[PDB]
């Protein structure tokens, strides 16, 4: 709130034209005055600022007019919705040569000069420029207060720029705004119970891209969070349902994909979304409606934004498992991890390992048993030992982005979006994609003798 | 539908201001009334330079070559190299990166192939001792620029390597009001792959016009030997006035082409240095655009800076008009109170812009 120009709205006016709304018949983009009181940083007075109002999406201003405040103070209730040179530069029509000629080419970096001979006649003597040629906390507090007083002092200047077009609706002033492109359902369901806030976007938070953050299962949330499992982020100003993907730098060499989040620690995460500054925190909710509330805690994941870009690359493990059928001493013939001579010809020279944890290397294709081929190892493979080829298939984020847009609904709660994986499975009455050999068992080590 | 330009002018600065503000840009009518119209080879290479520096920036060129679209992206930098075309030296390709540079995810180590210096463009000792100090006082701390090997027109063979790795959040706001006292006048004279008499007869022929001036003169010689000399013979002279009490610099240049007396070029550069310190106050006439771009791109403050009256040229007008039609920031002008010289003071409410690319 110290670096964003924000504003609660307390008064609302749908100044369209009634003959126009009767003309098109309930289809228009209702231009709307919002009479409110702004806070935060000064609002940039040039019309065209991106401002996000909550629960409809972000718009841009069209005209802004500050008014005398209806609830002033000594130098009282108010209840709406209830009972020369500078202009010589900046005027646009004239040419810069006309500007300089009535005041009295930039690819070429060197500044334009004149004839060197008369320059030398000018500077045969040099006496003109010969006059020119002769605690830490309260430290920073003094620096910022000195900045604030020179700020106010050089704001104390000529009126029409430092009061309405160079410093911009300074701090805490009652204003009227006019938007366009506001959908009809906002005005059609304008309940004054629910608030309508707004905040001026920075340039760095209008662009969409992929954010890398560090999440956490919230410590009173009862359920772990799945990858590619939709949740609604309260990042910054917006609130949007997106599809996160959770990664961990496995000892800071990579960014590999997980399946869920850890139970008690911070883990990295990535998702599509609008951009924001780094080092900014957010909350993130599961189901927001009221039909599905239960006795459960609603806040799912908190955490801050690490950094942002437009394309990250995350991988995941996949182990091409094979089977020996013909072992030898120190080498073996392995089967059906690959299927073709061209596949093993791609993978000539790759390292592998066994489930007994011994290293190995896939040496050459076998010719006729087209899947099978020949590999050498540290010592003897048993016939009952599955080999493993560690590889990294790259996955990528989904570009899904619904802002919640709560105050356009018919009912203003019971908001729905993408449901969770468990409940869409329960809705179409499927069963969880289990696997019979994947399940653990009470293992039974027997005392293995030797010959 | 966002921001649109006419005329094949000011092109590097329009692209770097688009990349700074984050706004996209159309530019139409790139020399449409020409016998050989369209976008030049060196500026096409400049756009490929920009696309290698940033990430996610999309650019379309007209098939007639007379317009260019640019949606920017984030700047990521990276350790790369760039061959530069022989139509244009490396100062032209390093000067817009010199103030797009301190804001990426990573450092800047982008070393340039090709011709070192030229007449119209920025020399390398020019860039160093006249654009490093203004940035070091604006708020960057480790910006360096080395020469692996020099070059010369028109054969080139020059290799130049800049690094910046003080990735600051935003430049601080400058408050320079006075007329800065000059503490020393230094300079260097280089010769790539000719005889070593040229440098000394440059230095003495330069310093004879300012031996009468009281201030201490120091010009340093450098020949360039062996393979490091490059592929064309040439020589040049750099003058820099240093204000060490607060750390400013003025600078003037030239190179000497074929059929040119080094004594006369040395005193020509010294008289153009006197020209610039006449026309200048606290910033150079070529140090000006980088400085005001930094003061508009720093923090949400008032940045004030004093210039004398003759700085205001058609370049200043077109730069102010361009910076308005990117992000609508008027500059206020404070005339100084002792006005036998009507010195303006550019005060700009800076945007509170910062880089949002850092790993944090």
């Amino acid at each position: 709130r110290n670096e964003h120009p924000y504003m609660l709205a307390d008064r609302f006016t749908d100044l369209t034209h009634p003959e126009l709304i009767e003309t098109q018949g309930l289809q228009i983009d209702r231009k709307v005055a919002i009479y409110g009181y702004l806070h935060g940083t000064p609002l940039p007075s040039a019309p065209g600022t991106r401002v996000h109002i909550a629960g409809v999406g972000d718009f841009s201003v069209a005209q802004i007019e500050k008014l005398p405040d209806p609830c002033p103070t000594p130098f009282l209730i108010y209840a709406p919705m209830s009972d020369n040179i500078g202009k010589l530069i900046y005027m646009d029509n004239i040419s810069p040569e006309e500007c300089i000629r009535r005041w009295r080419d930039l690819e070429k970096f060197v500044p334009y000069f004149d004839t060197f001979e008369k320059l030398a006649k000018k500077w045969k003597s040099v006496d003109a420029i010969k006059e020119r040629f002769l605690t830490w906390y309260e430290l920073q507090k003094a620096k910022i207060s000195k900045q604030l007083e020179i700020n106010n002092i050089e704001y104390q200047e000529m009126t029409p720029e430092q009061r309405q077009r160079i410093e911009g609706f300074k701090a805490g002033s009652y204003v009227r705004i006019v938007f366009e492109k506001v959908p009809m359902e906002f005005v059609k369901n304008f309940n004054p119970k629910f608030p309508i806030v707004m905040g001026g976007l920075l340039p760095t938070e209008i662009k969409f891209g992929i954010v890398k953050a560090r999440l956490r299962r919230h410590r009173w949330h009862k359920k772990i969070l799945k990858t590619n499992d939709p949740l609604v982020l309260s990042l910054g100003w917006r609130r949007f349902q997106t599809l996160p993907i959770y990664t961990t730098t496995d000892s800071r060499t990579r960014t590999r994909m997980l399946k869920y989040t850890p139970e008690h620690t911070y883990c990295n995460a990535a998702f599509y979304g609008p951009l924001c500054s780094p080092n900014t925190p957010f909350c993130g909710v599961q189901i927001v409606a009221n039909s599905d509330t239960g006795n459960g805690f609603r806040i799912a994941a908190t955490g801050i934004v690490e950094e942002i870009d437009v394309n990250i690359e995350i991988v995941k493990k996949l182990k091409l498992v094979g089977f020996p059928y013909k072992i030898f001493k120190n080498t073996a013939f392995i089967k059906d991890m690959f299927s073709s001579a061209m596949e093993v010809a791609r993978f000539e020279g790759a390292q592998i390992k066994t489930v007994s944890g011994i290293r190995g290397e896939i040496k050459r294709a076998l010719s006729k048993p087209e899947g099978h081929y020949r590999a050498a190892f540290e010592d003897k493979i048993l016939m009952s030992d599955i080999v493993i080829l560690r590889s990294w298939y790259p996955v990528r984020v989904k570009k899904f982005y619904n802002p919640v847009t709560s105050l356009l609904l018919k009912e203003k709660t019971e908001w729905k979006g993408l449901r969770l994986t468990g409940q869409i499975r329960a809705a179409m009455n499927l069963e969880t994609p289990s696997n019979p050999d994947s399940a653990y068992h009470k293992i039974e080590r027997v005392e293995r003798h030797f010959n | 539908k966002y921001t649109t330009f006419q005329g094949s002018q000011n092109f590097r600065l329009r692209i770097v201001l688009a990349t700074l503000s984050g706004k996209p840009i159309k530019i139409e009518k790139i020399r449409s009334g020409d016998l050989n119209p369209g976008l030049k080879d060196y500026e096409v290479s400049f756009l490929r330079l920009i696309e290698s520096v940033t990430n996610g920036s999309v650019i379309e060129i007209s098939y007639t070559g007379t317009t260019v679209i640019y949606r920017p992206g984030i700047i990521v930098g990276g350790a790369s190299t760039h061959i530069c075309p022989s139509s244009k030296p490396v100062g032209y390709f390093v000067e817009p990166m010199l103030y797009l540079a301190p804001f990426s995810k990573k450092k800047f180590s982008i070393l340039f192939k090709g011709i070192t210096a030229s007449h119209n463009d920025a020399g390398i000792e020019a860039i160093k001792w006249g654009l490093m100090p203004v940035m070091e006082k604006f708020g960057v701390r480790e910006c360096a620029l080395h020469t692996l090997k020099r070059g010369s027109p028109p054969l080139g063979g020059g290799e130049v390597h800049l690094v910046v790795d003080s990735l600051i959040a935003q430049p601080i706001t400058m408050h320079e009001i006075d007329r800065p006292i000059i503490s020393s006048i230094t300079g260097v004279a280089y010769s790539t792959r000719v005889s070593p008499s040229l440098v000394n007869r440059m230095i003495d022929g330069a310093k004879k016009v300012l031996k009468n001036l009281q201030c201490e003169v120091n010009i340093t010689a450098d020949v360039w030997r062996g393979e490091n000399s490059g592929k064309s013979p040439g020589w040049g002279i750099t003058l820099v006035a240093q204000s060490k009490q607060k750390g400013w610099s003025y600078f003037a240049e030239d190179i000497g082409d074929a059929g040119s007396i080094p004594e006369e070029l040395g005193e020509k550069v010294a008289c153009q240095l006197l020209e610039e310190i006449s026309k200048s106050a606290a910033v150079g006439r070529n140090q000006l655009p980088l400085a005001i771009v930094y003061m508009v791109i720093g923090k949400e403050d008032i940045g004030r800076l004093r210039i004398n009256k003759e700085q205001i040229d058609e370049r200043f007008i077109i730069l102010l008009r361009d910076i308005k039609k990117i992000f609508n920031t008027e500059v206020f002008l404070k005339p100084v109170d002792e006005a036998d010289n009507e010195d303006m003071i550019a005060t700009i409410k800076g945007i509170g812009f910062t880089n949002t690319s850092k790993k944090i």
Binding site: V310 | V58, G73
Partner: peptide, 7 residues
């Protein structure tokens, strides 16, 4: 890692 381009 790169996304943009020149066309």
């Amino acid at each position: 890692n790169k996304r943009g381009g020149v066309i």
